[PDB]
């Protein structure tokens, strides 16, 4: 009843040298488990786009004379820098769920939180407001969508049962 | 400033000067290449759509 998977799914099928937690992480989990070195990459990307434009016109100016670009482009550079920083942030932090990068301080937290909600009796992943067929379809859509970060952004907001874990 | 332009074989090719875009040279039937008279010269447009 609304949490039975009823499809067949690989179990602990690691994608790297490290054990996976999760086959698609929910978006709240990715924003939860990301390291401070990841917020680093967000900040370096918000800094690199306006400084990148001012540098790239220091090379060759647009009107022949070196003038600073307007604040109008520095705002859009800051926005798209947050965009690249968030793309790199989601991309790093969800490689850590796949077991393809170094997976030490998050396998412990995912022992901890899953065990801490097995004690409170509720579902291990959460009750969506979807019929289970829509959960299957909506997570065949969001499976492995982090490849293709170069084309389109797609995320997990669906909260479906299966994640490639041991039993459920 | 050369007397005979070559054409990647032993052939004579036309040295395209300003003098190839005339009303005489317009509508001479020929392949899409080895041909002069472009439709868009600053001398051929003659301030079109004025």
């Amino acid at each position: 009843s609304s949490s039975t998977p009823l499809v067949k799914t690989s179990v602990n099928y690691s994608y790297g040298d490290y054990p996976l937690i999760d086959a698609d992480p929910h978006f709240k989990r990715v924003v939860g488990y990301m390291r401070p070195s990841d917020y680093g990459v967000i900040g370096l990307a918000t800094a690199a786009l306006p400084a990148g434009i001012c540098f790239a016109e220091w090379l060759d100016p647009v009107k022949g004379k070196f003038a600073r670009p307007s604040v109008k482009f520095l705002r859009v550079a800051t926005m798209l820098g947050f965009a690249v920083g968030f793309g790199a942030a989601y991309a790093r932090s969800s490689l850590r769920f796949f077991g393809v990068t170094e997976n030490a301080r998050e396998y412990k937290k995912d022992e901890a939180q899953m065990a801490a909600r097995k004690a409170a009796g509720l579902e291990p992943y959460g009750t969506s407001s979807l019929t289970p067929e829509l959960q299957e379809i909506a997570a065949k859509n969001s499976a492995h969508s982090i490849a293709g970060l170069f084309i389109f952004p797609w995320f997990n907001f669906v909260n479906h049962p299966y994640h490639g874990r041991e039993q459920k | 400033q050369d007397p005979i332009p070559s054409g990647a074989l032993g052939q004579k090719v036309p040295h395209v000067d300003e003098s190839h875009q005339d009303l005489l040279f317009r509508t001479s039937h020929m392949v899409e290449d080895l041909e002069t008279y472009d439709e868009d010269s600053p001398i051929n447009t003659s301030d079109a759509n004025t």
Binding site: - | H29, E32, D33
Partner: protein, 81 residues
């Protein structure tokens, strides 16, 4: 030998006969689509033949292989000369 062989006939199979061979064959594949300044109708009646000629060519092939080789040599003759 220095004139009828060394400069005469070994340049016919060398850089003199092949210059004339490529001159003729290039001139024919250039002049494939010379006239008909209506280039849309000229290229559009060409797309039909090249899904008809291939389509008959394969029919001729899978009954006997040998009877497409002169067809292909004759297509090279009508194309390059």
């Amino acid at each position: 030998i220095a004139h009828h062989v060394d400069k005469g006939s070994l340049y016919r199979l060398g850089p003199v006969g092949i210059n004339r061979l490529l001159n003729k064959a290039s001139y024919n594949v250039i002049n494939l689509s010379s006239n008909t300044r209506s280039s849309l109708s000229m290229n559009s009646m060409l797309i039909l033949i090249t899904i008809v000629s291939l389509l008959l060519l394969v029919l001729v092939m899978n009954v006997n292989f040998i009877i497409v080789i002169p067809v292909l040599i004759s297509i090279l003759y009508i194309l390059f000369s």
